[PDB]
């Protein structure tokens with residue numbers, strides 16, 4: 001289930017983080033404009049960049065903490081507030097998060113690993129609701 | 138064959154019981170709703186909870202008794218009736234049991250351990266028929 005999926009991702013986090021982030025950027029290539037130095041690169045070029053794995057792991061490290069602090073896939077309001085107020089997220093709207101979760105759920109459904117993809121879809125919807133409650137446009 | 142599989146499973150009943158029950162919940166995550174104390178718990182947290190190990194072993198012990206009393210994977214009607222009339226099963230339907238046997242057979246086919254997975258599938262089919270005959274919806 002969802003709780004065990006957090007443990008599965010944490011046991012191979014850099015690989016899952018990069019693979020899910022690449023699935024996101026490949027499904028929604030214009031989302032590269034929120035980043036720097038990602039356009040014009042294949043997946044293997046991105047994975048050999050100095051910062052790509054490190055930044056994407058830091059993302060997913062915090063995402064798994066937000067998932068782990070949730071109750072029944074409902075995140076803490078304090079975690080949502082942090083994600084709204086982060087300077088790095090000042091250009092974002094809830095739509096950016098909705099696209100991330102579409103891509104993450106599609107990746108889980110296609111994976112050989114037995115993820116509870118429906119719970120991840122609910123967690124993303126509840127996270128988006130919490131971002132809106134915390135004032136993200 | 139099927140009789141050796143009962144001996145394999147019995148030899149390490151707690152481990153097989155827990156592994157097959159978690160394979161069931163992983164393939165059909167919605168089924169966790171019938172186990173309210175397992176919601177939101179990692180697999181290692183479940184294995185720390187006395188009743189997870191105890192109840193799951195006792196489930197599979199009874200399954201192995203029913204399997205052993207069967208003739209050519211046809212279970213006794215009396216055994217199907219015990220399962221229908223258990224108060225812990227009062228809100229189940231035959232589809233719950235069908236899903237358990239799909240997951241069990243998948244687990245056996247994926248395992249390194251030899252199993253007569255076709256016999257477990259047919260046992261499950263014949264048990265579901267018997268549960269329906271005994272009045273399960």
Ligand code: HEM
Nearest residue numbers: 031034035036054055058059062063088089092096097100
């Ligand atoms: C639940 C989802 C998310 C979490 C937990 C999260 C977390 C983080 C964290 C921890 C950082 C700091 C990375 C570092 O400095 O090394 C970061 C940076 C950033 N995040 Fe998010 N983020 C999420 C979703 C998003 C989404 C959906 C976007 C845009 C589509 C985005 C865009 C950015 C950008 C542009 C940065 C800074 C640039 C970069 O690290 O390359 N984030 N995020």
Ligand code: HEM
Nearest residue numbers: 168171172191192195196197199200225226229233234237
């Ligand atoms: C052939 C299949 C099955 C057998 C042999 C079986 C057997 C048992 C046994 C013996 C118990 C009592 C545990 C104890 O004394 O500690 C039990 C409880 C229970 N069973 Fe079943 N069961 C079967 C299938 C299922 C299925 C498919 C479900 C739900 C999807 C289910 C749900 C429950 C629940 C909720 C309880 C009570 C809580 C618990 O003890 O875990 N069982 N079962």
